[PDB]
């Protein structure tokens, strides 16, 4: 059971 | 010295998310390159949380990345930010 994730740095 | 967490997005107990605190915390404190904080982040997890986990750790960065359920975290310590996730 998986999910996608973004992140970004300020 | 005392950096401030700021947790950005979490899918993940409470409670790991303040091991990752804590131990990205005794990470900075440790080191100072980069990728030797990841590494230690990483190598912690696999063992307090069992394989596989992934750790970047910068102040300039963007990410997709897919992960288990209940096992991604992405936070600040200070001006740092850290991704720690597992999958595989
Ligand atoms: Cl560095």
Redesign the pocket.
């Known amino acids: 059971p998986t999910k996608d994730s973004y992140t970004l740095t300020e | 010295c005392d950096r401030k967490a700021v947790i950005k997005n979490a899918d993940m107990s409470e409670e790991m998310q303040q091991d990752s605190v804590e131990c990205a915390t005794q990470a900075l404190e440790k080191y100072?390159?980069?990728?030797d904080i990841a590494a230690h982040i990483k190598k912690e997890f696999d063992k307090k949380y069992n394989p596989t986990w992934h750790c970047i750790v910068?102040r300039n960065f963007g990410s997709y990345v897919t992960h288990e359920t209940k096992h991604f975290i992405y936070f600040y310590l200070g001006q740092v930010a850290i991704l720690l996730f597992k999958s595989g």
């Open positions: 100072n390159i980069e990728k910068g």
